[PDB]
Structures are given as C-alpha cells and as structure tokens.
Amino acid sequence: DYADNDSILLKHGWCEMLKGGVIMDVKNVEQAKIAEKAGAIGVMILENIPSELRNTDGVARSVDPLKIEEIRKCISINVLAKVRIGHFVEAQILEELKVDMLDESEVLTMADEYNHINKHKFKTPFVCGCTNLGEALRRISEGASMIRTKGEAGTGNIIEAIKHIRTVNNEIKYLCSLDESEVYNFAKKLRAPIDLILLTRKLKRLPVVNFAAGGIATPADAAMCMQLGMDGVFVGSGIFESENPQKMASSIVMAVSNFNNPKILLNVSLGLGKAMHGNTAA
C-alpha cells in the first residue's frame, strides 16, 4: 500500500513508460481490440451508454469492475479506469481489482465538492486534470503521479486544450525566471506548495508526466499538442465517433510517434474519412 516511501520513485518510474504514447477511451471489447491494434499503450474503460440515455443527465459513476475484468482479459496493453472526484471508496475498490492506473475525473459527477481523493493512500498511480499550474501542483501535492489537461471533453474542438497547454507552459518557464525572493508571493498567487514550485524550478518542467486530453479529433490536433511539449495524448470520441475508427486510431498513434515529421503527418491524414462531427457550443 501507500506511497511516499520510494514505491513513488516507483510510480513515477512506471508512468515514464507512457511517454510518447496514446491512451484511448473504450466502451466495449471491440473498441479495446481496435485500440490495441492501432498501437495504443493503454485503454481507458468507459461506461457503455446508448445515444437516447445521453440526452438525460444521469449520474456518471465508476464502471462495474466486471466490465473492466471482461475487457482486460481480451487484451495485453495497459488498463485504466475512472473514479469520481473525492470518491475514495470507488478508488479503494478498483485498487483491489489491480487496475494499472486511476483517473480521478471531472468528466464523472463530483462526489465531494471540496476535497479530492488523498492519492498517497494508494499503490495504484493516479492521473488528474488541470487547466493551470497551481491546479496541477495541488493535484501532485495530493499524490497524483501524472497530469493531463482538461481541455473540452467530447466536443471535438481542440481550442480549450491548447489554451490549457500554453497556460501551464508559460507559468512554468516564467516561474523558472523569477528570483529566489519573488518565488514566495508567486506561490501564494498560484495557491500551490512552495516545495513543488521550487522543484518545478529545478527540473525546468512539470515534475510528472503530462498528457494532453479533451477535443483531439485529427492527427493534426494530436501532433500540435506534442509540438507544444506534451508527453502524450488521451483520445476518446475523436476516434470512435469518426467515420473509420480503426484507420483514425492508427493515424493518431503514428502522428504522436512522428509529431515532428510533416511528411508522415500528411501521409497518415490522406483519405482519413470524416472526423467526429463535434460541437461548438461553449
């Protein structure tokens, strides 16, 4: 059980494996297989809902463990699951199930409006969402081993993701500039711990693996996030709501692995089919 011995140095070590990867959101075994086939380093398991249910506002909870077990035994890549913010019992349950990583996710319905899960209490590493550096550092403070941008989940619109990436990127390079005296007031402004601010300063980057997430819909979108210094990418609807999920899934992986090579980016974008329709309603 719990971290902050060097099982941490251990968790961090494990997360580094994910650098350069694409994690994909899957609703069933067929989708998992497509993801494995495309070169995904991992899948993130989602609740399987029909479109008619989608209209309603149902409470979105962590998935039935049996459905996770069912999908995991038909693939050999990494398996991740979601829990509700502040829902430490959902986490306890999935810890016992030996899942590879947990996402304390804002896409599910909040369980506790003030407190996030105390993530040090788990051996399973957590990923958390952020839109800015303070938020990111508070999640790491709480025990997150990995961070992602929030972006705008399910819209197929990259714009929020980009903003969040640039916001964190700037604050980090700026923080790195300030003098030793100035760092204190800045810590208070970000409402973040001075220790982790000093560590970000010494590392010249975010102290944990950092993925883009939310709104990625084309290979171009994916590569753009990588060119802006991200360690990797979560993709969901952009694949499985496209015209050709399999081809789209594969091209996104290729693009992430070759994000600096325009000729490959072009090549894997040819005859891709229609991307996810999406929604531009903020």
Binding site: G39, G42, S250
Partner: peptide
C-alpha cells in the same frame, strides 16, 4: 527501450 511492444512494433510498421 521499455514501453509497450504491441506498440513499439506497430511504430516500426509504417510505410
């Protein structure tokens, strides 16, 4: 290096 293989191999499969 270390990472997925069903990934590393796929990466080498292009063109």
């Amino acid at each position: 290096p270390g990472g997925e293989s069903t990934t590393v191999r796929r990466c080498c499969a292009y063109e």
